[PDB]
Ligand binder design. Structure first.
Ligand code: CL
Length: 243
């Protein structure tokens, strides 16, 4: 009874904004209660309605829907086995929102998604996204790829390199420093797994880009403020690498 009521309320279009936020928070509540029988009967219906709600014109509804999505990912990760590409694609797409709150909520959902999704399957969908998507969806995809690369074996990673590498080499040439930095950090993660077997894949990198990558590899080996500091430091170090 309750679930049908919540779904009907959330099916309302362009009206009843506060009542729909209550319905989303009731879904969040059921998720925090576990409500295992609700998911046994209604997982598909709830997930698909939630993903539609990502397209709502109200930013506070989009952000809240992403918070609910994150909770369902945390509590019911196994059921996403059959919705992997859909959930990755919708979550990445939300990163291009004009409203910072929606982007932040998409980032938080993406962080959780990266730890549950089958890693090889995730890497495979991210590769063409990284090569084709607009900024900052490409950025989000590279950051997700880094997290899933951290979850595969050397043997698996070596098999996936021919698909992974072109996007990282391309992204290292992007005009956005955030994308270049994300690519450097992804390459550091790849190197952490396969070591100097990365070498032949890097032949297209210029001297300055190799120097900068080497600097960050050495840092990883030797050891809000920290993040912002790191982002600016990357720009200064990159500047120095090109002189
Ligand atoms: Cl399950």
């Amino acid at each position: 009874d309750l679930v049908a009521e919540l779904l009907k309320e959330l099916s309302n279009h362009n009206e009843r904004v506060e009542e729909r936020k209550i319905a989303l928070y009731e879904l969040m509540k059921l998720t925090q209660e576990e409500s295992f029988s609700v998911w046994d009967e209604h997982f598909k219906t709830i997930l698909l309605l939630l993903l539609e709600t990502l397209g709502d014109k109200e930013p506070t509804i989009r952000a809240l829907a992403l918070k609910v999505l994150r909770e369902i990912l945390r509590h019911q990760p196994a059921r996403f086995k059959n919705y992997a590409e859909l959930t990755v694609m919708k979550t990445l797409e939300a990163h291009k929102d004009p409203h910072k709150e929606v982007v932040r909520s998409a980032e938080e959902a993406a962080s959780v998604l990266a730890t549950s999704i089958s890693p090889e399957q995730c890497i495979k969908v991210l590769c063409p996204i990284i090569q084709t998507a607009d900024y900052p969806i490409n950025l989000a995809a590279i950051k997700m790829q880094t997290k899933v690369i951290e979850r595969v074996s050397k043997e698996t990673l070596n098999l996936l390199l021919p698909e992974i590498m072109p996007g990282l080499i391309q992204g290292y040439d992007n005009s956005e420093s955030s994308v270049r930095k994300a690519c450097v950090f992804c390459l550091v993660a790849v190197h952490a797994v396969i070591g100097d077997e990365l070498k032949p894949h890097l032949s297209q990198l210029t001297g300055s880009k190799m120097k900068l990558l080497n600097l960050y590899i050495k840092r990883a080996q030797t050891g809000s403020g920290s993040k912002h500091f790191e982002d600016l430091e990357f720009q200064q170090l990159e500047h120095e690498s090109r002189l």
